[PDB]
Assembly symmetry: D3
Homo-oligomer: 302 residues x 6
Amino acid sequence: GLVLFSANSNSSCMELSKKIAERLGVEMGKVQVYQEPNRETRVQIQESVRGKDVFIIQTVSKDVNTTIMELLIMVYACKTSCAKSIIGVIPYFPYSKQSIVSKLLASMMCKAGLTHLITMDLHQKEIQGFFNIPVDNLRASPFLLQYIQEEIPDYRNAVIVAKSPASAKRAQSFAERLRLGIAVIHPITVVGDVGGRIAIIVDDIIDDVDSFLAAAETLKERGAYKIFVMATHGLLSSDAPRRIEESAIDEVVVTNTIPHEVQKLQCPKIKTVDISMILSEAIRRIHNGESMSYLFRNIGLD
Amino acid sequence: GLVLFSANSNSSCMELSKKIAERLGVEMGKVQVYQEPNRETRVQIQESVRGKDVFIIQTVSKDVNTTIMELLIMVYACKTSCAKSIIGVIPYFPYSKQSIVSKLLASMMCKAGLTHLITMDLHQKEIQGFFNIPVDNLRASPFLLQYIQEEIPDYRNAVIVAKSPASAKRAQSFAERLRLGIAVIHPITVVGDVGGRIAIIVDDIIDDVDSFLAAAETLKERGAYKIFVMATHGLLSSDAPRRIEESAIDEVVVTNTIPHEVQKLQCPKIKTVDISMILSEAIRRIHNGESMSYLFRNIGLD
Amino acid sequence: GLVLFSANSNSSCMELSKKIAERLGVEMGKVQVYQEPNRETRVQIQESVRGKDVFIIQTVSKDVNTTIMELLIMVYACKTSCAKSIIGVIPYFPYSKQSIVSKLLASMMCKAGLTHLITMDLHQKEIQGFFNIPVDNLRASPFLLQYIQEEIPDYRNAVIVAKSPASAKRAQSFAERLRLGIAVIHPITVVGDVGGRIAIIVDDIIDDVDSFLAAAETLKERGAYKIFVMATHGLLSSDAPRRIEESAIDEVVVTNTIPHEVQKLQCPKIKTVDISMILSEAIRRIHNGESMSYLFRNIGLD
Amino acid sequence: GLVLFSANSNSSCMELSKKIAERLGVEMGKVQVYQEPNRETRVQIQESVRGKDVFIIQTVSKDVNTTIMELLIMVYACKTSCAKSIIGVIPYFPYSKQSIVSKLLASMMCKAGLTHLITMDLHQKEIQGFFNIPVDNLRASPFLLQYIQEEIPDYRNAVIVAKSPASAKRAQSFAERLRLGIAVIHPITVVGDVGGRIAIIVDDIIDDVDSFLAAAETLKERGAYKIFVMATHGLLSSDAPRRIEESAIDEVVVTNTIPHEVQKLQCPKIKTVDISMILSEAIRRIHNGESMSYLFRNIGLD
Amino acid sequence: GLVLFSANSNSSCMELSKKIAERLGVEMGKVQVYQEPNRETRVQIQESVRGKDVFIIQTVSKDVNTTIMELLIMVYACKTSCAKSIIGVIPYFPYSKQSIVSKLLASMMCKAGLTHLITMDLHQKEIQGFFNIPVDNLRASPFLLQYIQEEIPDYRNAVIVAKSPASAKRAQSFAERLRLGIAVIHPITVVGDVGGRIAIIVDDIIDDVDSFLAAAETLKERGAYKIFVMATHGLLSSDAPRRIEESAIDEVVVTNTIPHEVQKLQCPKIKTVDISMILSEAIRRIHNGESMSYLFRNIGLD
Amino acid sequence: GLVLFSANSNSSCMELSKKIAERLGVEMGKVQVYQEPNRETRVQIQESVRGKDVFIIQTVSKDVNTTIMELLIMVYACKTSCAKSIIGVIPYFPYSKQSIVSKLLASMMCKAGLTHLITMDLHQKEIQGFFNIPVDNLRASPFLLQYIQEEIPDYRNAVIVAKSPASAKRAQSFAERLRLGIAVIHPITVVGDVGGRIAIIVDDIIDDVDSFLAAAETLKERGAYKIFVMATHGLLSSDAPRRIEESAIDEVVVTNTIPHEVQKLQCPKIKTVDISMILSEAIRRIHNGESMSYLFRNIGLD
Ligand SMILES: [Cl-]
Ligand SMILES: [Cl-]
Ligand SMILES: [Cl-]
Ligand SMILES: [Cl-]
Ligand SMILES: [Cl-]
Ligand SMILES: [Cl-]
Ligand SMILES: [Cl-]
Ligand SMILES: [Cl-]
Ligand SMILES: [Cl-]
Ligand SMILES: [Cl-]
Ligand SMILES: [Cl-]
Ligand SMILES: [Cl-]
């Protein structure tokens, strides 16, 4: 090792990779990722990779399917050029929120020649076992939790909310470390005590904004005076940022697992939280053959 | 096809297979499954299997690891004898409630030569994708739901309870079809309205009885006048049936995915629900090349 | 068997599949292929496929990478639903005109669960061996050759031209059956006798139009009085049809392996030739377990 | 490297691993191997294994099937934690004395992620080729032969006996190096000259004691004045040690490939021979990338 | 099904296949197997194989390595042409009498696309498990045993001899069914009673004739008045038939698993025994999906 | 690393390997490659290979099929002895000039355990993708081109000829770097200007000499005054060298990818060009983990 590549083809999607590089104190590898006039992808690796430990950094662009082919093709080229290890750093694993298609995607990535994966907060964490190679499915919560603590005034007067019974688990994990109660939404009503409190809605992803909006109206109706949304992944497809701006939600806090330049502008309610540290530390450990055990002991928001 | 085998080695674990056979209107295949004096397993298939479609029926005995080897070894023998298809009918998939070991188990089953699986109510249903062959992960709820309706008096005065936030999803699925509210437990308190109601606790499995007992004491304390437990799988390890008998739980309703002869005697609070119909219908469809789509339209409790 | 699906998501790309169905005298299978708001693909198979022989028909749309995922995902769903055979009918295999990426594409298709392929006129025909399953790499020339004969006046006063030395082989195959001479182009000059003759340029594909245009100007300069282009695949990316309309080329004759609605309108010089017969016959043979040997004895332009 | 684990869950089965560690001059790795109340196994690796060369030492306990799962599960965890190499040191390979089930066992071990094996005196040595990874199938005879020489008085007045024609090969290998004659048993009679001699019966395993007892009575009847049994593996199932104590056999000499605490007490005729040296040397070579060629030049009984 | 091919390229090696065809009452398939001037092999299958059950019959010629490539190449062509099953009928499996190279050979045969094997009397029968597909490893002894009975006068005054302790097992199997004693050879002496008796030496193969000759001289010296050799496989390499003619051996009886035209002429002591019946019956069962169980109940020498 | 082996069994075929060793400045590894009297192959590796990087050098002898088995068997032994990498250096890949059999050959080589390949001038270069491991398909042209320049007087008065339209590509590649015109042959005539010029016929292989002879007679007839043939591979089967000696061809220039001792004597028109440099440099790079990028910058004829 060690070599970092980005398999992304526009500036906005290469931001994360750029931050990870600044943190490790390295240059990015040279590559060209573009598109032929027939819309086929072209990856072209502009340096020796032989014997090296290569971390390919790949975020999800607007064109997810093209994101995949850029990744697959690049991984394949690294295999052909006899890289020693080909670690996918794919913080947001696509096709993962439901024949289980996240399995199929995992295979093609393995068949292409991936030999390790690093990723954050998998929609179902059983997807780790969809691969036939080692996988790190990383936590983002410490960074969100620490945000709640430092950036939300009056948090001890909050209640952690789950958008649906499916999110109840994650709500509980937040409440526990914040010593708080939980409420869970389930058209729809509420279970729990929400009146006269800040309500912090907690999920792994926010993309389809519908049932985040319904959660906000109900929580408002039952006397919650401030509504937040914390999610790992800010997919925020199509007219999400507008529907948020107009709505009861006071703030949306997501990480930078997925680039969302435009939506930030369309909606100043969206607050991004930088995660490159969790990512650069995972890569540092994996390169040096250190344990993963901790992994948060010395890293923070800061 | 069609041939049915049991890979179980004691009468109690062959009950289900026997019921499935009575339903399809067939003889069981001849096999011997026993144990050498050194405690190695012996499977011995006493008939031609060549070209045939073979459904191996395997429930979990006290000695789960031996259950596995009996299964693996039998599947292997069917492969060697050139069976056309080897369908595992493994209603309770072991090592499935949490390196994800249910993955490893799935591989060995595939490598052994399994070519299809039929199973009920998988702890995480993403385990379907741990295999590299087709899988039916079957519902048991219609049969439990219909029990609630017919065998519980005053059910419309119930609230469906989730033992932990993790079970919140399944509680919601029950409440919905029964037009009811839900409560969820999370030592511990309660979220929801439980006073002056029947409380029906709903999970996929009951084995470790601890947090079923705590759920019952709290539900009792908050004025729930009758406590039920419905779970697909009645593993009911060790001194479960006693701890239940003594406790607040008024009734425990499980299916026969897992044989539990002794525990029924140790505890008349346990009510088993027969499931062979769901199992014989899945096998009927799969043999005839029919769709699975329905699968409950014409079957019932009855 | 037998079931036909299209994995295409717009009317223009489903034309071929529709013609193949009319020829075999069958209904198309029910499926939905669309796109979520986050631009992930959705395939949804609306009928039993179990035990059946399923031919998935897939042409290449503008968004080739999405074409791939639609295909891959559909194939995977057919595998999950226990289809007996899953034959890809992919008349134009993408990423095939140059780590050899057409290999990678072939693997993912096999890993996804393809069990046979049918395709026409592969850029390099060694790509058949990039798969680990049987493949038919079909001829289109008899249909083009028969066009030359019937639709070109004065063809015996032609010379078959190869755009580059790479196309020399295919030119020779055309000349031979038409009892004609060949010329080959190689900025650039010409080898052969082209003066006072019709010049028919012959390739497997036309997408990047550049060196077709240079071939036409030179052939014009050396006294060829009429310039044709015959190619199997009419990819015709971007501003191809315009550059053709303006140019020396008098006519472009391509098959319908690739849908090109718009380009036909942008350029009446483009003449499409229907190929569904070669495709329906290959499918007829493969379903009935007949030989492929002939395959053209009884089919024609007509 | 280098890390040693035991996948055994009781003191008696961890003895060998403990001796191997004392010989190499290392600490054992930290692990927990126990059993849940439902009798599922739990392995838990209490240290970083990443990048390391890991030798998992596994002897066969009373519950052989559980021995397997403990092994399989541990190997899998080492794979997940990205060990560089996972060498099984499995001195007694179970299910090996006869669909050939020792093949199936070998696969699951490979599929689990084993990358090398070390083992002693395989029932059929063709089992090496049941794996898809390198295997050392180690000799124990030099250590038994040297015992005969040093610990048997009057050995030159022995005849090496084969229990059945199947053991004739191994008898011959012993006679040769001891410059002696052989006899072979085949109810039953004898081939060879046994009168007025010490008779040393030589096999790879002793588990089912039946035909060792018949061999002893016949050898006694034909005037052999002292009967020994030397076998690599002392499985010694069930009421073996008693049946030996009562019988004509004067001494049974086995190695410690298989722990047999209880049987030693039940029968002082059983003499164990320590083999950890052959095992620690094989591990020393394999770690250092040295040849195996010798392997006995410098090791002995001592 | 059903189609029979021979992958042999000279008349003498196609004899067996021809007899198998006469027995089943079928024509042989059309194929061409020859050699280019550069000595590469050419197989060319002159008929549709699609959907069919194809039994490729392959004996070992003088040029064993070419025998392999002819086989491998043919199997591959049958895979490409989408045969439903490709059963190798390879009565003598080469490279089988000792890295275990018979394993490697088995893989290439599986990778090539073999899906079943039929073979007789494998040097080590554990080689069945070197494949990843079903295998029948067939007996030849009933046909040799019946020869002893009918074609040897005074057989009850024989003793079955094993050339080396390694052959002791097989000698015992012969003695048992003939109710006789055994002797075993081990330069060299004898164990057993051979004086004044016919001595029948019994092995699976005879190729290297050396230790058959030494066995004969010793057996002669100890008063055996007539020496026979029965072996399944008559490889009989190089100057074997001469060395036999000159020697003490009175008769050599082998099967026709391996063609030996020339050696019969060079040595009228060699008596071949026809085996096509065992082979045609195995093929009959396997085609019809019948059991193999018997397999000798109704077949004989005759 | 590093260890070099030859898997060839006669002096003439070990010449290349010997030159490669002299260039790297190393001893060859000890091995024995011979043939048993039954004509099976024997490879026997006479040194530790464990952990080492092993380059097996294999040229094609008269008996190509035996060349294959020698290679396969040796590769397998290196796998068994736990070599770290097993690089095939197989400058002439057999069965490569046309079910595509070069695919089958590639698999068996991979299955045997090859982990890298080095080779020169593959008949179709798509054969790289027939493997599932990295491959270097090396150029020989710089060494032939430099020969033309230095060893042919009056080369600027040449025209590069393609034997058939299939060779047109390679002719063009030669003309380009030599700034010359091309002619292409296609019984037969000529396309291009050949009168009063030296004609240099350029192919990747010369084995079947037929259409080289026809190319020479026609080129002579149309006034070409001197005929050369340059090809990478000098297979030169059977009575090639004689047919050349008698013919119009003035000179044949081939590399030493394939040993041709006898043909040089039978025909002084054949001029061999040493290529060990391209081969030793490829091996140097691959051992040191350097790029391949250049690969000719510093090497030459010299
Ligand atoms: Cl999901
Ligand atoms: Cl998280
Ligand atoms: Cl879980
Ligand atoms: Cl359920
Ligand atoms: Cl190309
Ligand atoms: Cl074509
Ligand atoms: Cl055995
Ligand atoms: Cl031993
Ligand atoms: Cl052997
Ligand atoms: Cl036999
Ligand atoms: Cl070719
Ligand atoms: Cl070249």
